Design a protein around this ligand. Structure first.
Ligand SMILES: N#Cc1ccc(Nc2nc(N)n(C(=O)Nc3ccc(OCC(=O)O)cc3)n2)cc1
Length: 272
């Protein structure tokens, strides 16, 4: 990771929080192509001082994904360690997380839009699967909308997948249980069961989010009832747009080894 000086970064408005992170819009001053001076909008992710023990996990996940390059994976510019804080410096995506966008535009998004987004997400996961890289935190919040659909241009929306954040192999059990049903049942049984099959399950949950206008599945259940959900082997109800219900339940298979490959997922998406 390129190290960026604190002096080249301006912190602007808070954009909220992630897991043990604060999120800010910012600006980075840089010498760009042809020696031209640039002021680039950037997305700053700050690992809170209180959770400094988690520093290594957050930056190792960002780092391993950034060693790959792909059109559906977010760009990291570097890190800023010059100070009291550990900061990831990331490209600023104009429209933000998908879950927020879905809620704000529920009445204006149709099935073709959702399919286009699901295909792009599967393409990114296929790429990661072929490179045997585990993301570990696939969710609508971690999907970024680069561009909206422009009916007058025929151009479709474009999304990117954000960095994994802290690994579920090191998170507290309370956060893990609260992340049901994105976290697979076998990772609740044992966080060290993190595997490629993990991302197949979370892809299904994310698909449910997309098909549900940005609702959070099982949000009415507290932590103990979310555990009970897995104990009794329940499946999510069919979302509003039910066309993807079968794919969702196929991905959310309690048997990790029976979950389909993303190649097969893409074939099924393409059959609609
Ligand atoms: N209003 C508004 C607005 C507009 C544009 C943006 N843009 C923007 N550009 C990037 N790169 N962004 C993110 O990476 N976001 C993000 C932050 C925290 C996350 O946490 C996951 C977890 O840690 O659990 C996950 C994703 N976001 C953001 C907000």
């Amino acid at each position: 990771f390129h190290k960026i000086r604190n002096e080249d970064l301006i912190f602007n408005e808070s954009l909220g929080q992630g897991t043990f992170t604060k999120i800010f819009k910012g600006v980075r001053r840089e010498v760009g192509d042809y020696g031209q001076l640039h002021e680039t909008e950037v997305l700053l992710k700050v690992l809170d001082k209180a959770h400094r023990n988690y520093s290594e996990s957050f930056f190792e996940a960002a780092s391993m994904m950034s060693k790959l390059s792909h059109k559906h994976l977010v760009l990291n510019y570097g890190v800023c360690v010059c100070g009291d804080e550990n900061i990831l410096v990331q490209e600023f995506v104009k429209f933000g997380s998908l879950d927020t966008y879905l809620k704000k535009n529920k009445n204006c998004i149709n099935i073709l839009w959702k399919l286009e987004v699901a295909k792009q997400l599967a393409a990114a996961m296929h790429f990661l699967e072929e490179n045997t890289l585990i993301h570990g935190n696939v969710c609508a919040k971690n999907i970024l909308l680069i561009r909206e659909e422009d009916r007058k241009t025929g151009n479709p929306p474009f999304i990117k997948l954000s960095d994994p954040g802290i690994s579920i192999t090191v998170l507290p059990k309370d956060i893990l249980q609260e992340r049901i049903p994105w976290v697979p049942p076998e990772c609740i049984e044992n966080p060290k069961n993190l595997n490629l099959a993990t991302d197949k399950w979370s892809f299904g949950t994310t698909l449910w989010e997309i098909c549900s206008g940005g609702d959070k599945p099982l949000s009415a259940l507290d932590s103990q009832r979310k555990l009970q959900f897995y104990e009794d082997r329940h499946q999510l109800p069919a979302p509003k747009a039910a066309e993807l219900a079968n794919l969702i339940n196929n991905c959310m298979d309690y048997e990790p080894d029976h979950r389909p490959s993303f190649r097969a997922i893409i074939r099924d998406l393409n059959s609609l």
